[PDB]
């Protein structure tokens, strides 16, 4: 019934996501393209090269758009990160429009991520030239544009109310990355400060919507609370809908996660490489003095005029590669993929850093050089090994609301200030720290000094 590809034999001091990554490739040479590994007697099926991430992913898109399965009594594959068959399907779908301006008000993204611009310098000022660790500014802005869009708040830097709603997610993220030594380093007393974290984010949501369900109006919805309770009022007479309050508390726990780490992490590694290349930052203050000047604030249609800076911003993601084996897939039904019978339910692990990190497409694909995304006449050059936000149906759902926000913060902090390093460029360690799903980058601080020629 079942033929797994070809692999090492089962079973196979702390080990993070990189080394894992660097074991998988390895193993390409040895098997090819596609392989199994067996961790006793669960099979894992990992895809590296763009030409099988590509097969697969986008080419066989609805077989291979299944979430890999701890389980978590949690029980939170309620939402879009862990959910699976027709409940991801609509919640993803109403997720992707909502993100997408539909159902939720006049007000737009774009609105909601430059007033957070505005306010990012604001707090960078406060900083007053003085040494500076930037995690924790970085860290609020991308997590306020989802309050915004989920409750229609933003809060300030210090309000107490934002601080608890970020230390419980930062707790959860470092719980669950934890590297391995086999097994998942972690079990000493996590398993349940995870729960209780989880109880209470739900909990805070789940007082949000309570108020929204009072001023409840079919023809006034603002946010994504709001648009959710008028797609259930719809969904009435249509019982057992998918849309549910539990589901409502799941998705926007989903999305506060998601939406929050990936890109302060990936702002916290852009201006580490910035201060380790200045000439590239110089090229890139220059282009937005020419295109938007310090006057007004940038906006996306100023990308199209900033192809140097679309370079580097691009190059960041590649770079950076910042989930080197995205999240874990698994098939949907059983599938003929190549000479293989791959049964339904069958975990499946893609390699981004095989598709990123392709040195055909991206010659010396280890370096950092805008140049990878720009042609020999220095236009912007786009590509399809452009994977960071992954493939297919279960491409990341927020990659319109990341690209306008590494954008747009990116511009506005260089618009508004130099980037002093306290080390000297030249010695400067820029190698990523040990983490089980992610690229992090090593602790730095900065100062941030006000503009001048
Ligand atoms: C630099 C920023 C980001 C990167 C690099 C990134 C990357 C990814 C990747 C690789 C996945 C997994 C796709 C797969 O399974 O193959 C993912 C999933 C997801 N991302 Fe992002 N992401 C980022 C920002 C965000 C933001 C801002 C949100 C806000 C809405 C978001 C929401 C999600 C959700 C909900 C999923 C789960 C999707 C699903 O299972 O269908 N992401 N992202
Ligand atoms: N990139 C990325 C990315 C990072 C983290 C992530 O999971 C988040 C983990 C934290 C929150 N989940 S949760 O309920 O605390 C948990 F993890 F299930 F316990 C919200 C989802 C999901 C994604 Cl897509």
Redesign the pocket.
């Known amino acids: 019934r079942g033929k797994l590809p070809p692999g090492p034999t089962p079973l196979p001091l702390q080990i993070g996501i990189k080394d894992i990554s660097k074991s998988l490739t390895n193993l390409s040479k040895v098997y090819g393209p596609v392989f199994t590994l067996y961790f006793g007697l669960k099979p894992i099926v990992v895809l590296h090269g763009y030409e099988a991430v590509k097969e697969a992913?986008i080419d066989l898109g609805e077989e291979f758009s299944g979430?890999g399965i701890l389980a978590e009594r949690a029980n939170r594959g309620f939402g879009?990160?862990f959910?699976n068959g027709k409940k991801?399907k609509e919640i993803?779908r109403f997720?992707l429009m909502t993100?997408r301006n539909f159902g939720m008000g006049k007000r737009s993204i774009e609105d909601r991520v430059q007033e957070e611009a505005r306010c990012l310098v604001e707090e960078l000022r406060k900083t007053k030239a003085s040494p500076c660790d930037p995690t924790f500014i970085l860290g609020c802005a991308?997590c306020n544009v989802?309050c915004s869009i989920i409750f229609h708040k933003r809060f300030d830097y210090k309000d107490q109310q934002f601080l608890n709603l970020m230390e419980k997610l930062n707790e959860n993220i470092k719980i669950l990355s934890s590297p391995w030594i086999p097994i998942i380093d972690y079990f000493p007393g996590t398993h349940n400060k995870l729960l209780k974290n989880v109880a209470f984010m739900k909990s805070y949501i789940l007082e949000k919507v309570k108020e929204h369900q009072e001023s409840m109006d079919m023809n006034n919805p603002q946010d994504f609370i709001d648009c959710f309770l008028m797609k259930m009022e719809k969904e009435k007479h249509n019982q057992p809908s998918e849309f549910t309050i539990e589901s409502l508390e799941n998705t926007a726990v989903?999305?506060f996660g998601?939406?929050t780490e990936?890109?302060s992490t990936?702002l916290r590694y852009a201006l580490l490489l910035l201060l380790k290349h200045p000439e590239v930052t110089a090229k890139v203050q220059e282009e937005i003095e020419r295109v938007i000047g310090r006057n007004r604030s940038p906006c996306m249609q100023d990308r199209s005029h900033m192809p140097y800076t679309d370079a580097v911003v691009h190059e960041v993601?590649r770079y950076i590669d910042?989930?080197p084996t995205?999240?874990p897939?698994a098939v949907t039904c059983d599938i003929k993929f190549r000479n293989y019978l791959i049964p339904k339910g069958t975990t499946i692990l893609?390699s981004?850093t095989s598709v990123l990190h392709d040195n055909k497409e991206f010659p010396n694909p280890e370096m950092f050089d805008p140049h990878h995304f720009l042609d020999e006449g220095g236009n912007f050059k786009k590509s399809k090994y452009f994977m960071?936000?992954?493939?297919?149906k279960?491409?990341?759902?927020?990659?319109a609301?990341?690209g306008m926000?590494?954008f747009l913060f990116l511009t506005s902090i260089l618009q508004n200030f130099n980037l002093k390093s306290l080390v000297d460029p030249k010695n400067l360690d820029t190698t990523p720290v040990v983490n089980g799903f992610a690229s992090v980058p090593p602790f730095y601080q900065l100062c941030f000094i006000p503009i001048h020629h």
């Open positions: 992913l979430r879009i990160v959910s991801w993803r997720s993100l991308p989802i989903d999305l998601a939406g990936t890109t990936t993601q910042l989930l995205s999240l897939h893609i981004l960071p936000f992954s493939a297919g279960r491409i990341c759902v927020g990659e609301l990341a926000e590494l």
